[PDB]
């Protein structure tokens with residue numbers, strides 16, 4: 001509904017397309033993941049990121065990237081390396097940081113001249 005909201009909704013869509021199972025769609029709770037609220041002090045997921053975009057809570061692309069990387073880092077902390085959760089998190093962390101790279105953002109900035 002503002003330019004930044006629209007750009008971030010775009011990025012979120014593209015990241016969520018890489019999670020066909022919806023592993024990261026909603027907050028992980030203790031009711032599904034024993035010890036999660038002890039092990040993971042700052043949970044994050046795509047649903048919560050969608051809400052923050054909607055609420056225009058991200059001042060910048062940096063802040064949005066921070067939330068994305070927190071989500072992936074938590075998945076890689078709580079879950080063992082042979083799991084679907086860990087693997088996908090590692091994968092989509094690198095895919096998303098390529099998508100939203102400093103170089104790609106600079107080009108986007110020149111185009112907004």
Ligand SMILES: Cc1cc(=O)n(C)c2cc(N3C(=O)CC[C@H](NC(=O)OC(C)(C)C)[C@H]3c3ccccc3)ccc12
Pocket residue numbers: 021022023024025026027028029032033075078079085
């Ligand atoms: C144990 C566990 C750890 C973890 O890091 N993640 C991301 C999980 C995700 C889980 N989920 C799935 O395995 C299948 C999808 C499910 N998401 C989901 O159902 O989303 C909709 C409703 C959109 C289909 C996801 C999950 C995430 C959060 C709470 C419960 C299940 C279940 C357990 C964990």
